[PDB]
Structure 1
Amino acid sequence: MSVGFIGAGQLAFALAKGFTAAGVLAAHKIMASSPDMDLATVSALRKMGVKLTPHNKETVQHSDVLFLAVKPHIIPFILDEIGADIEDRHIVVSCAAGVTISSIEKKLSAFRPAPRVIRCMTNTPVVVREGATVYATGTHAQVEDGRLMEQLLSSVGFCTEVEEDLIDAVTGLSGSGPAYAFTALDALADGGVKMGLPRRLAVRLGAQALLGAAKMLLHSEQHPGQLKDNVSSPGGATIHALHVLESGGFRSLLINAVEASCIRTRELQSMAD
């Protein structure tokens, strides 16, 4: 099985690194073409053994599974460029926000009538094989196409099927989620430094605290509120800190963030019309 990447190099690098680290694909079975790929990600992909080309048509001819990371305003040009090169064997997997299955199918059907299209919402931690991925299957995706995509993406993290109309919300939650965590870890480290810890220790402790808490929740049958209750002793340090989070509307800020990212993806889709 050959895999190709067209579009944003950040997507190509993350999944190629995860796939090769998982051992589910040899690097020479991966080809990538990009217009925005920087020297760092170009050099990193070459050193991995990934094939690189400036020609999107070459990526299509190489690939069985073709990942697209192409924004809605560029989709008409790319699909017109490669549409005639899509074959019966191809599964086209689109990863950019605001690009609907319907838009891709309509554009590709101008060339061949039953394009196999899947939409993917994944995130950067696939690079350490702890991604969160959902996918939705298109009109002509065979049932084995969804199973194949789930097997591939489960090698680099959590993966499950959803209806397409949930992808905007997933984007606001686990797509953008890692950036919320990086912000939180920077701030928690600032807090540790304010209270006297060296920066490097503060970053390590905060990141380990977040990793361990998330793993506890994933391996627990308990509600996150129950785990919060279990850790906070009466009159203790943690419940005092939880009060100051509540006084700042901490919960509402995170709700605001998921909502804002989700709505922005809907706006990006409306700009494709």
Structure 2
Amino acid sequence: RAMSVGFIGAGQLAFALAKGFTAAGVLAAHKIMASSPDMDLATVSALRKMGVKLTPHNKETVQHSDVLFLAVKPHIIPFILDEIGADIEDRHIVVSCAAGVTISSIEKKLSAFRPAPRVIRCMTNTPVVVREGATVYATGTHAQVEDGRLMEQLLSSVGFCTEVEEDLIDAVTGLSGSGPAYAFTALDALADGGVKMGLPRRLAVRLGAQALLGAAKMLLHSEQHPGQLKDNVSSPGGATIHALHVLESGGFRSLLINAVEASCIRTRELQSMADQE
């Protein structure tokens, strides 16, 4: 409650969480801080207005914060854990969200400054900026169960949360992590196809969006199975099952798996590459 946070990063993710948290009525813009190594107008400059504390020094951060956020590239994360390992008290917990980067790697390199540091691996997506991001996390080794509670609660604030054994997190990042982007492609497309029927741009876009939205909810608030709800929507006649056929005839399902697999697989590499070199 007397808690105040910081992101040593910025960029999207930061602004994502930053924004969702503010709007969540949880923290308070000013009671927050992130470091601008350089300054990316969009992000950085955005925040400026939002009401968040920005410091070039991702060290002033470290202090200002009771809960720390690592929102940096997966290869940059090493060069920081050894720039602040020292400046790391025991009052705060570290939530690293860098893709694929392992607790261990963090811990075991960052502990070279503290007997038992407290860290959690996190996996989230941009839609957090509202309240529908999909978040996952795994508890470190030096992590008490009052930290996995603040985490689990701090995030449900902006979406959906759950504990997951770190290993699953590479897959997860494929689905929920990138998914927001599979979606945006989906729609931009639909909008076009919408428009390629008469519908105007603004219009097609929003209905295509609403179309999706709707589907989600139905699937979440029930089991049903995506399969069966599909059945509930296609009258033996056509118009829908017909659109399906085409999708089904261009490997639509397929090209989504390959996107998950690929997303996943890239994350595997990126980390199992930062392990040696």
**Could you report, residue by residue, the CA deviation over 1:172-209 in whole angstroms, capped at 9, with x for unpaired residues?**
00000010000000111111111111111110110000
Distance 2:83 2:191 in 1: 47
CA contact (8 A) 1:80 1:107 kept: yes
Q: Secondary structure at the match of 2:27?
A: coil
1:256 Cα deviation from its structure 2 partner: 0.6
Deviation at 1:271, TM superposition (A): 1.9
SS at 1:152's partner residue? Answer: helix
Structure 1 residue runs of 5 or longer lacking an equivalent are none
The residue that corresponds to 1:235 in the other structure is 237
Structure-2 residue corresponding to 1:103: 105
Residue matched to 1:67: 69
Would the aligned equivalents of 1:9 and 1:37 in 2 still touch at CA under 8 Å? no
Per-residue CA deviations over 1:65-109 (Å, capped at 9, x if unaligned) read: 000022332222211111111001110100011210000101111
Q: Verify: 1:205 aligned to 2:207, yes or no.
A: yes
CA distance in 2 between counterparts of 1:163 and 1:37 reads 35
Cα distance in structure 2, aligned partners of 1:53 and 1:81: 16
For residues 173 and 32 of structure 1, the distance between their equivalents in structure 2, rounded to whole angstroms, comes to 27
Deviations along 1:24-74, whole A, 9 cap, x unmatched? 101111000032641122222121211000001100011110000223322
Indicate the SS of the match to 1:173.
helix
Moved more, 41-50 or 151-160: 41-50
More helix by share: 1
Percent same amino acid among aligned pairs? 100
Return the alpha-carbon distance in structure 2 between the equivalents of residues 213 and 84 of structure 1. 48
> Which residue of 2 is the match for residue 25 of structure 1?
27
Cα contact 1:7–1:34 (8 A) shared by 2: yes
TM-score, scaled to structure 2: 0.96
Residue 73 of structure 1 contacts residue 271 of structure 1 at CA under 8 Å; is this kept in 2? no
Partner-residue secondary structure (3-state), 2:134: strand
3-state DSSP class of the match of 2:161?
strand
| Residues 8 and 37 in structure 1, CA contact (< 8 A), matched pair in contact too | no
Alignment gaps of 5+ in structure 2: none
Shift, 1:14, TM fit: 0.5
**Contact 2:55 2:61 (C-alpha < 8 Å) held by counterparts:** yes
- Runs of 4+ deviating beyond 6 Å: none
The worse-fitting range, judged by mean Cα deviation, of 230-239 and 40-49 is 40-49
Query: Distance in 1 between the 2:216 and 2:128 partners?
Result: 16
CA distance in 1, matches of 2:178, 2:128: 13
CA contact (8 A) 1:57 1:85 kept: yes
